[PDB]
């Protein structure tokens, strides 16, 4: 089964969202500033490609409109999302849970039902004291299967 590298400097996959012109290599988590400096990365260090919900975080940087997840808001309901691993191209469609604040604006959409999903997180303003990206917006995509 698809495995995420132990070496944090090695690419684990590729994520693409055509409608938003996003094409990025995905690195192992957790998503710290160093990891996001490398590219978008898995949310948690213990993430698994066999999980029902796979989370990937990406930066928002206005100096570079098409950098990582800066242009993710351009991906509306129904937008195709491609997650490429070594042996498969997984396809997902953006749901109505998009561009929403992590808490109270939106929550568990399919984390338990309706199948496999990808949770894309735009991250900004990392707080070293708490280990949290204070500025976050989530986008949930469900597998086309």
């Amino acid at each position: 089964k698809p495995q995420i590298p132990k070496d944090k400097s090695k690419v684990a996959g590729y994520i693409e969202i055509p409608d938003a012109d996003i094409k990025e290599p995905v690195y192992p988590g957790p998503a710290t500033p160093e990891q996001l400096n490398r590219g978008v990365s898995f949310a948690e260090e213990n993430e698994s490609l066999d999980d029902q919900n796979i989370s990937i975080a990406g930066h928002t940087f206005i100096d570079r409109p098409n950098y990582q997840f800066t242009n993710l808001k351009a991906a509306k309901k129904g937008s195709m999302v491609y997650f490429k691993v070594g042996n498969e191209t997984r396809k997902y469609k953006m749901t109505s849970i998009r561009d929403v604040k992590p808490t109270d604006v939106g929550v568990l959409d399919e984390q338990k039902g309706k199948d496999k999903q990808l949770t894309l997180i735009t991250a900004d303003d990392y707080n070293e004291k708490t280990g949290v990206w204070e500025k976050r917006k989530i986008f949930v995509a469900t597998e086309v299967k």
Binding site: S55, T103, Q111
Partner: peptide, 5 residues
């Protein structure tokens, strides 16, 4: 949880 980054 939804998650964080």
């Amino acid at each position: 949880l939804p998650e964080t980054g």
